[PDB]
Design a protein around this ligand. Structure first.
Ligand SMILES: Nc1ncnc2c1ncn2[C@@H]1O[C@H](COP(=O)(O)OP(=O)(O)OP(=O)(O)O)[C@@H](O)[C@H]1O
Ligand SMILES: *P(=O)(O)OCC(C)(C)[C@@H](O)C(=O)NCCC(=O)NCCS
Length: 1023
């Protein structure tokens, strides 16, 4: 070996770094913040000092342990490797501050630590630590130890300080306690043992099987620590009683106490993620199994991805399966984390750690307990057993860039209440126990569902009849070829309703309707309602089968049709009321209002939808649910907005219930059209003050400048609403309100509403519930999810349907008992949609639960156009990546700028790798979109096989460096770092070999400018 013997005489030993050591420097120097894995421990001490014996005692310890004389040589050699220097002098800093009061003394000490912790170490120059003294009285003094975590774990520090203080007193004649020689020790024996382990096929295949089809999870983020600096420690109270009960539980189950505390961690993660399949890092203390193999100092840690599914059960079952998953991976535990995953595919967001441990002249620390230390984990649960009380306690160490105090306050409560339940009610089902704070329960369940409003009872047509009395000569409908006054419309609805009544239609009688969109259509609706029946909507502009499958399901009493559509019908064996055939017999009927004793609980209509697989399902909507919607709409929309409401939606769909009956309830008029795309070619387009449609259709009308300047409100509902679009609509200055509304057919037409602000930033929400409607975000066990967590959207209140027609079993499945109401009838409708709450109570709609897709990093959903459409193009790999479909407006967009812009705003696993610059996106009419008809892209390479543009704007030195460390021939200037096989651990030796080459770069600059092109510019010289 010409390296063993080509070492400085300074160095006596040399051996490579572990993947963790390189992982730690990677995190320490990821940016210039430089606070992670630089630990600073201080100690306030009543004693008699010995600044010479204290110093010499350090010299005894540093020569005692090679890791305490270790330098780092990163780039210069083949692999980064640790250089063990033969001996080093190490000073002890001193400050005298007796002249200051005790309160002033800690201000100046914390000031010293705050300065020291970001004061980086020079790896190549030993030692990787510093000591320091602050003098207060001749007996009060602070001793501070500042070190880098790549050299020492918390265990190493513990026994490092121990050997110290019994060689400090050794040189003091207080008690002579001789120190024993070092054992068969080597941090290399571990470094050598960890190398053997990376190439062992039994470790690789084991974790390959254990992690096969995991569901990775990121914690929810809706806050940051922009207030607290480095008090990123959250203290979770644990009382004496609860510590004892936690110990009792581990005895009863028969596992070590650590497995009880680990099960609490798993409980809160499942709660926070609404995920039963949970992965979290277990901090393992990989010491050499020989005796006196835990007295050697160094870094012996590996963090393993423990996987576990929370099916449910008593707490004791969760404990036992936390024990089962720990021994399961006991022997295979030294396989390093970096070899498990890849850079940018972190296996877990969080981690668990448990710290077991255990006179008057000096010895005792008076205020010696301040430990500053940070990891790279967003949430580390730092359990320990206090050495003197033997009581359990917990500190949540969190990443303020990812979790704020408004969030950590709730996380800490979840941990506190989880440990309460385990210690006191440790025999309940853990998946039903309420871990949410009393404050959070009230806000999620009460305050954000406080929508009760007392409206007049009654029916849909009663709202119309009353408006006829109040303005009988006002216009009710304007079609292309006629109008009708409120009296004129009413009198015909009475006449048709009487003819139907004397044909034999009464309460709960279903009469369908297949009519071309003319005023007889609305007359048909109103006459059916005025008699006391309920209409089943049919639209002649739809294929004949769709009509048949509904009539089949509904089995209607009789059908109102025109002579021109009976033909379209498959000879419905029931009674027909071919309208024009016997208009003569209509006209004999009275014009007076039928005043039948209709109940608001009678069915008003049966709206037919399709399930996920495509079966018919008729939604039975009562009058009171519709009147509640209309009465609420009276409050929200003005008379000037309701002056002319466009009737564009097919009555087969529930948005027609809003467009038709609402203007008739207030005095406005239906501006009737065949669809929203006929609006520009319509006579009364000038009269339209409100349109009620779907985002794509209003985009259609926007390109061609087809929105009448008299339109003052736009109601949007039915697909994803881009804030880019509401901002165009508001730019037409007459448009005064733009609403995003949500609601399944099972909850009448609308369930939630949001008056999307002008200039509003970010995703538009679907808002919060309308009058007499309640919303809940639950898990599979119908438990409310924490604020910000994704869950199933449930809806209750006055808008819920009776049932699915002729399908009572599906009705029970979808309309479940309401756990949050005492009322007898109280149901909740399972929407099948996912959602979460924004902090202000607004609801963030996340789509149906079925098509929410998957990938490593974190398996969740797409719908992230907020940055266009995203797709999943399954290729014959069955190994996949995210695809974009962009358009833009004028000049091209730097597609990479569109990724780094999202790098600091959106998570990396969600950020796609493939872009497509398009123009024409698919749509087969104005509603049905075709995801499967999106252009399958081509791999950017080929055509340019050995595509190698020369590299002349100082890529020169950068390309050199990539080439030497990555073993590839030469690089192209537009190549990406991670695609040519670079990772986090390699990013360091890229920064380092760029250092002596005259360039300063950060690992953060590598991960946001991974191309050799944009990385070369942000590179610096610094004279
Ligand atoms: N990505 C999104 N961002 C904001 N709002 C959305 C999004 N997707 C749907 N919505 C809202 O949901 C309401 C109606 O549900 P919608 O049919 O749009 O759900 P979807 O996600 O588009 O469809 P699916 O439920 O089939 O995934 C509309 O008000 C619409 O604004
Ligand atoms: P890159 O994306 O490959 O980065 C890898 C890593 C640095 C995140 C990882 O390999 C790593 O080293 N994690 C550190 C494990 C740890 O924190 N151990 C001690 C916890 S106190």
């Amino acid at each position: 070996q010409e390296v063993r013997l080509n070492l400085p005489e300074e160095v006596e030993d040399a051996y490579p770094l572990t993947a963790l050591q390189l992982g730690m420097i990677f995190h320490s120097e990821y940016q210039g913040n430089l606070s992670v894995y630089h630990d600073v421990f201080t100690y306030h001490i009543r004693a008699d000092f010995s600044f010479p014996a204290l110093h010499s005692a350090i010299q005894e310890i540093v020569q005692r342990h090679p890791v305490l004389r270790t330098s780092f040589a990163l780039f210069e050699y083949q692999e980064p490797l640790q250089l063990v220097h033969r001996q080093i002098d190490v000073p002890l800093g001193l400050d005298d501050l007796t002249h200051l009061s005790t309160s002033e003394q800690d201000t100046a000490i914390d000031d010293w630590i705050e300065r020291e912790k970001i004061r980086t170490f020079d790896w190549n120059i030993p030692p990787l630590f510093r000591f320091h003294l602050h003098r207060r009285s001749q007996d009060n003094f602070n001793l501070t130890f500042s070190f880098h975590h790549s050299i020492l774990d918390g265990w190493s520090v513990a026994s490092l300080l121990t050997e110290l203080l019994q060689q400090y007193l050794y040189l003091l004649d207080k008690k002579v306690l001789p120190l024993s020689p070092t054992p068969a020790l080597s941090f290399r024996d571990f470094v050598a043992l960890e190398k053997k382990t990376i190439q062992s096929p039994e470790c690789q295949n084991y974790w390959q099987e254990k992690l096969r089809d995991v569901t990775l999870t990121k914690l929810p983020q809706w806050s940051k620590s922009n207030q607290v600096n480095q008090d990123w420690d959250w203290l979770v109270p644990i009382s004496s009683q609860v510590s004892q009960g936690l110990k009792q539980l581990g005895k009863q189950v028969g596992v070590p106490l650590k497995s009880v505390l680990l099960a609490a961690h798993f409980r809160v993660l499942s709660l926070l993620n609404n995920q039963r399949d949970i992965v979290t890092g277990l901090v393992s203390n990989g010491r050499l199994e020989a005796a006196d193999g835990e007295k050697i100092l160094g870094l012996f840690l590996n963090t393993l991805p423990l996987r576990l599914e929370l099916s449910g059960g008593p707490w004791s079952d969760l404990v036992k399966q936390a024990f089962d998953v720990e021994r399961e991976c006991l022997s295979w535990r030294r396989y390093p984390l970096a070899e498990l995953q890849k850079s940018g595919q972190p296996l877990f967001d969080t981690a668990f750690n448990f710290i077991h441990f255990h006179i008057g002249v000096k010895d005792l620390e008076v205020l010696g307990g301040k430990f500053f230390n940070q990891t790279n984990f967003t949430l580390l649960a730092n359990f320990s057993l206090h050495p003197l009380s033997s009581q359990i306690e917990l500190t949540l160490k969190y990443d303020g860039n990812y979790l704020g105090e408004k969030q950590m306050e709730l996380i800490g409560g979840y941990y506190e209440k989880t440990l309460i339940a385990m210690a006191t009610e440790g025999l309940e089902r853990y998946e039903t126990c309420c871990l949410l704070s009393e404050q959070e329960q009230h806000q999620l369940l009460k305050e954000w569902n406080d929508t009760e409003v007392h409206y007049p009872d009654g029916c849909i047509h009663q709202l119309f009849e009353e408006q006829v009395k109040r303005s009988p000569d006002a216009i009710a409908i304007i079609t292309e070829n006629e109008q009708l006054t409120y009296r004129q419309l009413n009198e015909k609805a009475n006449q048709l309703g009487r003819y139907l009544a004397r044909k034999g239609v009464k309460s709960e009688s279903l009469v369908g309707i297949c009519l071309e969109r003319t005023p007889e259509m609305v007359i048909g609706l109103l006459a059916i309602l005025k008699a006391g029946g309920a209409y089943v909507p049919l639209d002649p502009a739809y294929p004949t089968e769709r009509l048949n499958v509904i009539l089949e399901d509904a089995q209607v009493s009789l059908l109102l049709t025109q002579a021109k559509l009976v033909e379209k019908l498959g000879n419905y064996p029931g009674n027909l009321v071919i309208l024009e055939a016997e208009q003569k017999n209509i006209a004999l009927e009275s014009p007076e209002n039928l005043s039948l004793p209709v109940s608001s609980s009678n069915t008003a209509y049966v709206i037919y939808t399709s399930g996920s697989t495509g079966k018919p399902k008729g939604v039975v909507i009562e009058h009171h649910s519709t009147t509640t919607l209309l009465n609420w709409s009276k409050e929200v929309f003005s008379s000037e907005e309701l002056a002319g409401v466009l009737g564009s939606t097919s009555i087969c769909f529930d948005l027609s219930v809003f467009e038709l009956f609402l203007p008739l309830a207030v005095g406005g008029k239906i501006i009737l059209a065949q669809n929203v795309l006929d609006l520009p070619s319509l006579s009364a387009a000038k009269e339209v003050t409100l349109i009620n449609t779907v985002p794509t259709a209003i985009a259609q009308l926007l390109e061609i400048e087809a929105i009448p300047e008299t339109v003052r409100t736009v109601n949007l509902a039915g697909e994803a609403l881009s804030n880019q679009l509401v901002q165009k609509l508001y730019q037409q200055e007459n448009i005064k309100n733009v609403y995003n509304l949500y609601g399944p057919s099972e909850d009448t037409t609308y369930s939630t509403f949001s008056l999307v602000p002008k200039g509003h930033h970010g995703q538009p929400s679907i808002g919060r519930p309308i009058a007499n409607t309640q919303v809940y975000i639950l898990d599979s066990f119908k438990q409310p999810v924490p604020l910000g967590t994704i869950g199933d959207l449930y809806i209750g209140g006055e808008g819920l349907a009776r049932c699915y027609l002729n399908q009572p079993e599906l009705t029970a499945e979808k309309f479940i008992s309401n756990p949050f109401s005492n009322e007898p009838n109280a149901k909740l409708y399972k929407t099948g949609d996912l959602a979460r709450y924004l902090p202000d109570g607004n609801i963030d709609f996340l789509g149906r639960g079925d098509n929410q897709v998957k990938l490593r990093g974190f398996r969740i959903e797409l719908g992230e156009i907020e940055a266009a459409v995203v797709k999943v193009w399954e290729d014959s790999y069955r190994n996949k990546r995210l695809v974009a479909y962009l358009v833009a407006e004028n000049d091209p967009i730097n597609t990479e700028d569109l990724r780094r812009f999202l790098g600091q705003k959106l998570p990396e696993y969600m950020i796609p790798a493939l872009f497509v610059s398009l123009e024409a996106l698919p749509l087969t009419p104005n509603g049905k979109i075709d995801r499967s008809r999106l252009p399958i892209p081509e791999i950017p390479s080929t055509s340019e096989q050995d595509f190698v543009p020369p590299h002349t704007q100082k890529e020169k030195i950068l390309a050199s460096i990539w080439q030497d460390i990555l073993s590839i021939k030469q690089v192209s200037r537009y190549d990406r770092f991670f695609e040519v096989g670079g990772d986090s651990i390699i990013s360091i030796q890229v920064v380092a070999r760029a250092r002596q080459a005259g360039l300063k770069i950060t690992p953060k600059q590598i991960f946001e400018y991974p191309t050799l092109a944009e990385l070369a510019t942000v590179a610096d010289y610094s004279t």
